[PDB]
């Protein structure tokens, strides 16, 4: 129950720094075993309900897609006849790690599991943190660098979710313990309709809450808010939250009722959390209201900035709706109902830029092939995580072009010179087998035809072939984004091919004993949990 | 140091309310508490 010193340092992402905790190796093995055991036993004993994210069943883009579908599948979610409103609020539970009381944590951990495990975990969070000549005992808050800290924080966050929702609404959302609901589904429409809180999720420390308000309850909420905190000078609009990257017509003015409902929703959610445990600050929030005035639903999940436009608003062609657009369907009428417009948030454009800056500052004393390798990893990670939204976002393409230019400039400065004629595209983008740098490209790089000729020596002459003479058109460096299947199509094919797999399993077990590897060759590289 | 001096910021009634909320939720879902990893428990080696 008494443990060693834990080293602490900072990792620099150039915009934020985070503490990294270095633990003694033998205790690392004990904590890794405890972590695996606790996650396994929590899964089989059904500790975590559906809203506790990240679950082991979605990639984060599939989480954003499922959230959009769960928004779209609700009852009358896009109707505004009786003046009703929709409020989606995204916020970040502030100082949850700093403000963990270890005695209360020990008690709650004793609630879910054996007291020896709880005692070990609480004694593990009380260690001495040392950095160089500085050292102090951590007796308040949790250590995020222990192996089992993910499980402990997901349990503590589940308790905070209970405090935000209330036990009745949490039981209604999570469903009965015998047959729990899936993600963003209810048992029937009566259970869904009864409470204003329609959807809820928590990604570690960020909660997304989706509320549906009829006219009278919204009126009562706004009346209570201005009764508690009056502001008669129309100063409530000064400082509200809205996204600027959406166009000059796609974003509309924010009226009295919308801003007042957003502030009332935030104040009501802040009134539920004890400040001695956690809070939601107004600067970390983003609230968007769907009303009769603005027909837009704004949120931003896992780095995708999503704007939802129901199709019962473009009846007179209000908006273009021609992009890399997720097309949302209704599960009742089985037809298209809303469109989701994707952008990459400017924070993640900054994260990619900071990753490239990290590459260029960790690698001045490195080889050119190392620069190309690190660049390839960064570009592939970006384009295979964002896909559609990377193509739609203009700022991301500008940043990608500038960062690729910086990588090539680092190679050039390495040689001695930055001379463009000295460096054809064949130097950089040749595959590494032929001695090239093997860079992958996400920029529009045209290849002049002077790099399409070759000499050959024969016994009766020497032939200087110039290919592409019949064209006056340059061949273009292949964009990486044309080799990555978009997310929406990948999800659709995943659903389709998994229903097919269940079909062949049903008519395979009433026949053979094992499914072969010939009937699933057509279904080989399909499915988000790939088959 | 400020937490040692200025006491637990989570007051006693707040901690009691949070504890009872967790208790009522956990009995409502009929949660079986996690045992200590037993001596035999085959899955141990795979988990290891």
């Amino acid at each position: 129950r008494a443990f060693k010193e834990v080293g602490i340092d900072m990792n620099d992402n150039y915009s934020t720094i985070n503490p990294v905790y270095d633990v003694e190796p033998i205790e690392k093995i004990s904590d890794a075993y405890l972590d695996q055991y606790l996650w396994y036993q929590a899964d089989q004993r059904h500790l975590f309900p559906n809203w506790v994210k990240p679950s082991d069943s979605e990639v984060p883009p599939l989480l954003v897609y499922k959230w959009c579908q769960g928004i779209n599948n609700l009852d009358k979610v896009w109707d505004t006849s009786n003046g009703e409103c929709n409020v989606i609020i995204e916020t970040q539970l502030s100082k949850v790690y700093e403000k963990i009381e270890l005695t209360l944590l020990n008690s709650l951990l004793r609630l879910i599991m054996d007291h020896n495990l709880a005692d070990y975990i609480t004694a593990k969070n009380n260690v001495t943190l040392t950095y160089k000549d500085m050292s102090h005992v951590n007796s308040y808050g949790m250590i995020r660098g222990l192996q089992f800290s993910a499980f402990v924080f997901q349990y503590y966050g589940l308790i905070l979710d209970l405090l935000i929702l209330g036990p009745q609404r949490a039981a209604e959302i999570a469903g009965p313990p015998q047959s729990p609901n899936d993600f963003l589904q209810f048992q029937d429409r009566d259970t869904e309709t009864r409470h204003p809180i329609r959807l809820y999720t928590r990604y570690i420390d960020k909660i997304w809450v989706f509320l549906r308000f009829t006219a009278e309850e919204s009126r009562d909420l706004i009346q209570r808010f201005l009764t508690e905190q009056p502001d008669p000078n129309f100063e409530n609009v000064i400082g509200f939250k809205s996204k600027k990257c959406w166009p000059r017509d796609s974003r509309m003015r924010l009226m009295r009722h919308d801003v007042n409902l957003g502030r009332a929703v935030f104040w009501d959610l802040k009134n539920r959390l004890p400040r001695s445990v956690t809070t939601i600050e107004w600067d970390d929030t983003f609230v968007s209201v769907y009303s009769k005035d603005n027909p837009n639903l704004l949120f931003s999940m896992c780095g995708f900035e999503v704007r939802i436009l129901p199709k019962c608003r473009n009846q007179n062609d209000e908006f273009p709706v021609k992009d890399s657009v997720w097309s949302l369907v209704d599960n009742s009428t089985k037809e298209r109902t809303a469109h989701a417009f994707l952008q990459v948030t400017e924070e993640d454009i900054q994260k990619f830029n900071n990753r490239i800056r990290q590459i260029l500052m960790s690698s001045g004393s490195t080889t050119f092939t190392k620069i190309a390798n690190k660049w390839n990893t960064a570009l592939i990670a970006l384009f295979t995580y964002y896909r559609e939204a990377a193509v739609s976002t203009v700022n991301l393409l500008d940043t990608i072009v500038k960062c690729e230019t910086k990588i090539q400039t680092r190679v050039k400065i390495g040689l001695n010179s930055k001379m463009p004629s000295r460096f054809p595209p064949a130097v950089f983008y040749t595959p590494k087998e032929l001695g090239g740098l093997g860079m992958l490209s996400g920029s529009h790089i045209l290849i002049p035809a002077s790099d399409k000729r070759w000499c050959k020596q024969t016994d009766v002459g020497i032939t200087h072939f110039r290919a592409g003479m019949s064209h006056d058109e340059e061949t273009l460096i292949p964009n990486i984004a044309r080799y990555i299947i978009p997310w929406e199509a990948e999800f659709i094919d995943s659903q389709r091919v998994w229903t097919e797999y269940s079909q062949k399993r049903l008519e395979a077990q009433q026949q053979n004993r094992r499914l072969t590897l010939e009937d699933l060759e057509d279904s080989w590289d399909r499915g988000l949990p790939r088959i | 140091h400020n937490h040692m001096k200025d006491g637990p910021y989570v007051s006693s009634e707040e901690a009691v309310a949070i504890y009872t909320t967790t208790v009522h939720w956990l009995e409502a879902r009929k949660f079986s508490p996690i045992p200590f990893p037993s001596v035999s428990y085959k899955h141990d080696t795979k988990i290891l």
């Binding site: 400040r275 001695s276 | 400020n2 937490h3 200025d6 006491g7 910021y9 007051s11």
Partner: peptide, 8 residues
């Protein structure tokens, strides 16, 4: 009988 938080 009111606590004083660290940030306040």
């Amino acid at each position: 009988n009111a606590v004083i938080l660290h940030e306040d």
